[PDB]
């Protein structure tokens, strides 16, 4: 594993060569002073250990690995013996390079830890780092997964001067790592890595390797379950990973950051959302341009809106649009309902919102869906902070964590509320959640489109009409239309079951597909006798008043 | 045990079989494709589903040596001794042969490395991370882990290279329960009357060990019904009764009627004895409820043939005592699906967020042990119109109703959970809850008519001795505005 | 006993549990009685410490894991079953739950007869009237 | 004493109670006095900690259990009886709850006579009138 194995981090790699490689083989130009330690941080799985092994291999300097949590011992004070023996051997043998992995096990901030061996070893390590003659030129390599849990005493001049933020790669970096990992295996010709890198968004470093391995695994299963190979040279050499394997692996795999927040699959398409044509057009305009055409943003010089709020009467399709965005936008998506985050303990609520937004930034680009915002971002009001100011603290954390998203972050927040009156007006200020889409009640054509989209997978009578239903349902909603269709289906099922019962009765006393083949005129006629309007006129009046106020 | 003992999980069985067999059966094929296979898997799911059973089967079948690590077992009192235990285990496993590590109850060893405050714990987490990933991390070794709460694991452990694949050992389907029943009812002797297909059909939430318990209880009933005719026979038991036990279908029925799913053990409803004949009148309401509850659970082929979804919610409303709670009890006693009886204000709590936590737990249990029936008594107590309260406890009621809204309709699935509400004040219920798709059926239970009062009187006098010449038609004709309670 | 197992050293409560179970299993088919289990075995999700979670996991793996048990029966007693880890309320660990509830009139009569069988009672005693008039007595 | 037994380490307060009880039982028949028990043992269901639950369970097991006590008497003192675990207020743990309430006029008379026994008093003052005048004074 040489310098050519790590990819996607040319700039960050370039500093590493300058920081530790050039000043180690010639200290003359620096004297005509390089640090005695370099920190690397970033999300897990970013090639930290890979880079450390590549620098350890390419340079012939002696290498002495001390894994962080492996320096302690059971006997009295043998941890100190281990540490100073490591440093003395590193100095005495040669101008070596030492790599300390998982430093967090060695420097737990000295603020929460109340042990004694940890204090002794951290202070001794501080003294050792203090004692380093400029002529040896030995440097230490540190590797931390979480940078904020570090003893700040080490974060000072002379101790680990320059840090290097090994972040997530861009599209070009993802393509480069894809090539690096897939060059050894025999990849079939009918494959283009550019498309896989344009569709791969949150994967970092190791997840790409997982993707390739999974695709290969599926192909191996495809050529093992069917052939039933149960040694076979002809089977051995006839192995080639095609495009469908990579598509399947992409459809199955998930960024490691969003592993905990896996969402149940609800497959929706844009033809399922009947009506709302202009709303769908505006939503596409808002969401696909910032994520696919950065050149347009650069040319315009205007910051696109980074939020949107759906409001309207219940049963109009806010959650349906959220599902459609989650499924068919080609970007990450983390769904949250308001009350999930709150916790009885002190601090946990804010830690949870901070963690969720940290994950959102990690798997950038992302679409964080806040459903029913009327619970976590309620009006301040005169609640007196009876919960120790818990709600106030939660909303304050949400505001500070939503306003601190620059252009590079690329995190789009989707709002959806039934009652917009209880939303804190601070949220609706420009720069946080500026755009507000209003989802009105369907018109006759929208209702017809909804019915056609809901009856897509339903066997239906050839001699049937829906314009009558549309013309009849006047103040109805999408949920109401769903109720009509489900009731008609239930009547059809009842007829089918009773007909099958009768047929079996006089049979026991080849069957067709069913006694009742399709949804029928009479089924809809009887289903429409018990259809009642979902939302009354008072709510429509109040929503119209709110809309006109805007 | 063997691969023919684990039942109800075929996809996952193949997923672990692949990792355990192919890199130890056809290494040449993986050298030909070029890459190495994944070498880490995490088993997760509800307790008593078969993860540890699968680990045992793998240990028995694979011909390499197998090492088992219980979670807390590694830790010790001497400073830096757990680290030595982990290092010794991993090095011995690597040195001796290609092997399978099994980490049982990983939740004890990976407490998120961020919420913990013990130094030694974070030391053990970092040591495991180093052993599973780093310089010379692995040379032909694979690690399987088992957990019940995978979200309480450090994300650094849940990355490719350490734990590549997460297999979901979840609740089985009807076919899965049939397979489990056939597996567990092989060695025992059954009478011809037993029908395992019906047993699997009426079992609705039983998973693995639940089925095992059912079988054991049935056997216990057989032994405790066919020993009273004989004495204790403490010295010895004779062959004629030792043979011909024959666990009958009535024994299986009794054991199924006594038991409950392990998930709902905490919320078991007290037994109530009502019947459809106990509920007088309301013929249309009883038939509508019966068809709307029994159609999705008994006839799913028709629903999938039309490809639509069934109706879930229903709301009874009317004057008090008309028979709403009685209908709910009748459903609880008659319908085969599980029953979750919850009162209105039961789930509220003084703390912050614990009301919504309780609601989430109840609905998670309901969708876990599906098909399930959830009865929300007096919905107007917890689900009132939002914004009315001028002075509130930090808007806790609003948060509760929003939690109900999102859980009953949100980013979830339709696992056949039926919400029934019973309130006599439908004016206080928020309009959002009454939307179709959340509670679509609003059933009005009016005051009884002449024939309904007669039916009610006969229903209530079905177990009482009566005068031969007494007729109830006069009483019915004389009570005009009365209710069932009257 | 419930809190008898916990010690200040990190990793010693589970050692005590392991020693107890191995000693119980090494002998003839034995019975292990765990009194006041609400202390040893709370829900892991609701607790916030670490030693209790580790003890619960040790108990779980001892009760039902690879090489589960060998003719050893475990009995438990508690005043609150709802505050117990759901993984322990399972077949294999605690399959059967007996409900030792309040006695009825006949049960209370039996209790009176049992508790007044060794003392020097008078001739005037009718235990039936006492068992009738005592209503909510738990024994 | 109430809080004197509590500690910070896991499994130390229960060890203190065990040491106290075993030391008491090792010697001749003895009396134990748990002053201000309401601090040690509040209701289990209405507490958030874990050490308080463990020490409550330890008290329960110590006073009632297999081979509980032998010629050892336990006495308690508290000001808030209702804020105690109901499982503790049963026969075998605290058999009878004696109500040491305020005294009457005669009781106050004896209290005055007891307290004024060592100080030199003048003949004019009569303690009976003082006892009659005082109404709510206790001890």
């Amino acid at each position: 594993v040489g310098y050519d194995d790590i990819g996607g981090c040319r700039k960050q790699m370039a500093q590493i060569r300058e920081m530790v490689e050039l000043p180690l083989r010639h200290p003359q130009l620096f004297k005509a002073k390089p640090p005695r330690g370099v920190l690397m941080y970033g999300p897990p799985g970013t090639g930290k250990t890979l880079m450390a092994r590549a620098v350890a291999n390419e340079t012939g300097a002696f290498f002495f690995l001390i894994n962080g949590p492996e320096v302690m011992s059971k006997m009295a004070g043998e941890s100190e013996s281990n540490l100073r023996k490591a440093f003395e051997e590193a100095e005495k043998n040669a101008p070596a390079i030492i790599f300390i992995d998982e430093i967090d096990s060695i420097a737990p901030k000295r603020d929460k830890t109340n042990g004694e061996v940890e204090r002794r070893v951290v202070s001794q390590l501080l003294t050792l780092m203090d004692g380093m003659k400029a002529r040896s030129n030995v440097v230490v390599i540190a590797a931390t997964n979480r940078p904020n849990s570090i003893d700040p005493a080490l974060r000072r001049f002379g101790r680990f001067d320059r840090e290097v933020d090994i972040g997530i790669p861009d599209a070009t970096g993802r393509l480069e790592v894809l090539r690096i990992h897939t060059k050894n295996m025999k990849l079939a010709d009918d494959v283009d890595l550019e498309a896989l890198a344009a569709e791969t968004h949150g994967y970092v470093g190791a997840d790409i390797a997982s993707l390739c391995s999974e695709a290969a695994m599926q192909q191996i299963r495809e050529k093992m379950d069917l052939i039933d190979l149960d040694i076979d040279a002809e089977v051995l050499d006839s192995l080639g990973v095609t495009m469908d394997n990579f598509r399947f692996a992409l459809g199955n795999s998930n960024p490691s950051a969003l592993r905990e927040t896996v969402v149940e699959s609800v497959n929706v398409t844009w033809d399922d959302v009947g009506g709302l044509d202009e709303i769908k057009e505006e939503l596409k305009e808002t969401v696909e341009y910032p994520v696919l055409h950065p050149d347009q943003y650069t040319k315009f010089g205007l910051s696109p809106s980074k939020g949107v709020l759906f409001y309207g009467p219940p049963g109009t399709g806010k959650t349906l649009l959220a599902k459609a965005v989650a499924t068919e936008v080609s970007a990450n998506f983390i769904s949250v309902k308001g009350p999930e985050l709150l916790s009885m303990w002190y601090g946990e609520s804010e830690s949870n919102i901070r963690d969720i937004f940290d994950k959102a930034r990690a798997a950038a680009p992302t679409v964080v869906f806040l459903d029913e915002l009327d619970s976590i971002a309620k009006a301040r009001g005169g609640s007196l902070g009876d919960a120790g100011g818990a709600s106030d603290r939660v909303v304050n954390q949400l505001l500070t964590e939503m306003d601190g998203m620059n252009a590079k972050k690329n995190v789009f927040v989707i709002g959806a509320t039934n009652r917009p009156d209880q939303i804190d007006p601070a949220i609706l200020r420009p720069g946080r959640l500026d755009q507000l889409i209003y989802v009105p009640l369907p018109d006759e054509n929208a209702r017809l489109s909804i019915l056609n989209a809901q009856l897509r997978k339903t066997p239906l009578e050839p001699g049937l009409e829906l314009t009558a239903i549309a013309k009849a349902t006047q103040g109805f909603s999408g949920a109401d239309l769903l109720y009509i269709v489900q009731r008609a289906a239930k009547y059809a099922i009842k007829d089918s079951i009773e007909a099958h019962r009768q047929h079996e009765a006089e049979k026991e006393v080849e069957p067709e597909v069913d006694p009742v083949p399709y949804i029928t005129k009479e089924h809809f006629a009887e289903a429409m006798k018990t259809a009642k309007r979902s939302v009354s006129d008072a709510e429509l009046r109040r929503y119209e008043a709110y809309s006109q106020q805007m | 045990v063997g691969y023919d003992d684990i039942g109800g999980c075929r996809k996952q069985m193949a997923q672990i079989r692949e990792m355990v067999e192919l890199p130890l059966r056809h290494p040449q094929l993986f050298k030909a494709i070029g890459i190495k296979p994944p070498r880490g898997v995490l088993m997760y799911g509800p307790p008593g589903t078969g993860k540890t059973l699968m680990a045992r089967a793998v240990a028995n079948e694979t011909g390499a040596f197998f090492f088992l690590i219980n979670g807390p077992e590694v830790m010790s009192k001497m400073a830096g001794e757990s680290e030595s235990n982990l290092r010794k285990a991993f090095e011995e496993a690597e040195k001796n042969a290609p092997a399978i590590i099994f980490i049982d109850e990983i939740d004890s060893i990976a407490p998120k490395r961020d919420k913990t405050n013990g130094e030694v714990e974070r030391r053990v987490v970092s040591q495991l991370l180093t052993l599973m990933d780093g310089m010379k991390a692995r040379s032909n070794v694979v690690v399987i882990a088992a957990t019940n709460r995978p979200n309480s694991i450090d994300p650094a452990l849940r990355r490719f290279g350490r734990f590549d694949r997460e297999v979901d050992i979840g609740i089985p389907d009807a076919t899965g329960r049939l397979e489990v029943l056939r597996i567990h009812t092989k060695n025992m002797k059954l009478a011809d009357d037993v029908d395992l297909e019906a047993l699997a059909a009426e079992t609705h939430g039983y998973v693995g060990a639940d089925i095992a318990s059912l079988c054991s209880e049935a056997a216990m009933q057989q032994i405790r019904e066919k020993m009273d005719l004989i004495d204790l026979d403490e010295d010895e038991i004779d062959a004629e009764v030792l043979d011909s036990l024959g666990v009958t279908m009535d024994n299986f029925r009794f054991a199924l009627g006594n038991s409950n799913p392990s998930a709902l053990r905490e919320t078991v409803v007290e037994s109530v004895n009502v019947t459809w004949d106990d509920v007088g009148g309301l013929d249309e309401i009883k038939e509508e409820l019966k068809e709307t509850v029994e159609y999705p659970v008994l006839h799913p082929d028709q629903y999938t043939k039309f490809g639509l979804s069934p109706s879930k919610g229903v709301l009874f409303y009317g004057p008090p005592g008309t028979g709403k709670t009685l209908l709910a009890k009748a459903v609880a006693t008659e319908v085969s699906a599980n029953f979750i009886s919850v009162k209105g204000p039961e789930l509220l709590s003084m703390w912050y967020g614990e009301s919504e936590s309780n609601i989430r737990d109840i609905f998670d249990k309901a969708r876990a042990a599906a098909p399930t029936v959830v009865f929300l008594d007096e919905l107007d107590s917890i689900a009132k119109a939002r914004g009315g309260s001028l002075g509130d406890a930090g808007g806790a009621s609003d948060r509760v109703v929003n939690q109900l809204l999102t859980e009953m309709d949100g980013m979830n699935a339709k696992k056949n959970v039926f919400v029934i509400g019973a309130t006599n004040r439908p004016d206080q219920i928020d309009p959002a809850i009454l939307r179709p798709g959340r509670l679509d059926q609003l059933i009005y239970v009016p005051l009884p008519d002449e024939n309904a009062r007669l039916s009610i009187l006969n229903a209530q006098l079905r177990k009482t001795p009566l005068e031969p010449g007494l007729e109830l038609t006069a009483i019915a004709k004389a009570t005009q505005g009365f209710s069932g309670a009257d | 006993n419930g809190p008898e197992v916990m010690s200040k050293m990190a990793g010693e409560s589970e050692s005590n549990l392991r020693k107890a179970f191995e000693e119980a299993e090494k002998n003839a088919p034995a019975i292990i009685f765990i009194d006041e289990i609400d202390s040893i075995a709370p829900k892991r999700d609701k607790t916030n410490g670490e030693v209790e979670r580790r003890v619960v996991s040790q108990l779980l793996t001892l009760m039902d894991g690879m090489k589960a048990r060998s003719n050893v029966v475990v009995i438990a007693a508690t005043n609150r079953p709802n505050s117990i880890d759901p993984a322990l309320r399972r077949f294999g660990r605690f399959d059967r739950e007996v409900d030792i509830g309040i006695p009825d009139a006949t049960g209370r009569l039996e209790v009176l007869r049992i508790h007044t069988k060794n003392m020097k009672l008078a001739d005037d005693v009718d235990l039936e009237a006492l068992a009738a008039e005592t209503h909510g007595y738990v024994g | 004493n109430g809080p004197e037994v509590m500690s910070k380490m896991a499994g130390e307060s229960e060890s203190n109670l065990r040491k106290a009880f075993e030391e008491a039982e090792k010697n001749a028949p003895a009396i134990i006095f748990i002053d201000e028990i309401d601090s040690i043992a509040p209701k289990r269901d209405k507490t958030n900690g874990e050490v308080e639950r463990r020490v409550v369970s330890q008290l329960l097991t110590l006073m009632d259990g297999m081979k509980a006590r032998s010629n050892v008497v336990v006495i308690a003192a508290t000001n808030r009886p209702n804020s105690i675990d109901p499982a503790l207020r049963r026969f075998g743990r605290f058999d009878r709850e004696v109500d040491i309430g305020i005294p009457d006029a005669t009781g106050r008379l004896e209290v005055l006579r007891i307290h004024t026994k060592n100080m030199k008093l003048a003949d004019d003052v009569d303690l009976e009138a003082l006892a009659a005048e005082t109404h709510g004074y206790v001890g």
Binding site: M344, D386, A387 | W351, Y352, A393 | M9 | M9, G49
Partner: peptide, 22 residues
């Protein structure tokens, strides 16, 4: 030789109260 020790004391919770207006 040295030795370690475990300790878990408590945390801090939050309550919610109800008020009456007029």
């Amino acid at each position: 030789a040295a030795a370690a020790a475990a300790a878990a004391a408590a945390a801090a919770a939050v309550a919610v109260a109800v008020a009456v207006a007029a």
